[PDB]
Amino acid sequence: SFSGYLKLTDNVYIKNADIVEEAKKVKPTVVVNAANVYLKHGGGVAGALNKATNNAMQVESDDYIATNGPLKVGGSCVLSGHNLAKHCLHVVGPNVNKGEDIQLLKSAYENFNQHEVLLAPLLSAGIFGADPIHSLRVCVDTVRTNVYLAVFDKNLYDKLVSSF
Numbered sequence: 402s403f404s405g406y407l408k409l410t411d412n413v414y415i416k417n418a419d420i421v422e423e424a425k426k427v428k429p430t431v432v433v434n435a436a437n438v439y440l441k442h443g444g445g446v447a448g449a450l451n452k453a454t455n456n457a458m459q460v461e462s463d464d465y466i467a468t469n470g471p472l473k474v475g476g477s478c479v480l481s482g483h484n485l486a487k488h489c490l491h492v493v494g495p496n497v498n499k500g501e502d503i504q505l506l507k508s509a510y511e512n513f514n515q516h517e518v519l520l521a522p523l524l525s526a527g528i529f530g531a532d533p534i535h536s537l538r539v540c541v542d543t544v545r546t547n548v549y550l551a552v553f554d555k556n557l558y559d560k561l562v563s564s565f
């Protein structure tokens with residue numbers, strides 16, 4: 402059901418799109434959230450997905466944290482997709498602006514291999530402070546399942562495609 406994606410490899414596809422608008426259109430089985438260890442969906446992709454669920458994602462996430470404690474950096478948990486998807490795979494990539502180890506990004510992408518097809522952002526890019534070109538390279542070299550990447554920024558999308 403995905404459309405207008407550019408094929409990068411056998412299993413990796415990319416599109417200049419708002420992941421919230423893409424999610425409401427496709428209603429995929431899994432939408433990936435660029436989460437932090439506490440599942441506090443304040444800004445970036447996480448704040449945009451949470452706002453699209455009318456804060457239902459935050460309420461569900463606080464109950465998950467109250468029961469299980471925080472995630473590890475490089476880890477993940479599967480929660481409801483609410484009105485956007487069947488499931489939301491909350492993945493924690495290293496936040497360079499918090500001094501976290503960029504080496505954990507490959508461990509972060511390995512979480513995608515547990516799902517046949519996913520709609521996702523570039524992990525650790527944006528407000529997480531990592532080089533998006535490096536994030537796309539780690540993605541293509543780590544994920545074996547079908548991943549459809551949504552890149553919000555037009556200028557960044559062009560840079561990623563032209564330098565791939």
Ligand SMILES: O=C(O)[C@@H](Nc1ncnc2[nH]ccc12)c1ccc2c(c1)OCCO2
Nearest residue numbers: 435445446522523526527528533552553554
């Ligand atoms: O367009 C994007 O998808 C991307 N923006 C940028 N990623 C890097 N340098 C950038 N320069 C200008 C925009 C930009 C992004 C924005 C928020 C994000 C995110 C990724 O993933 C994790 C947390 O929230």
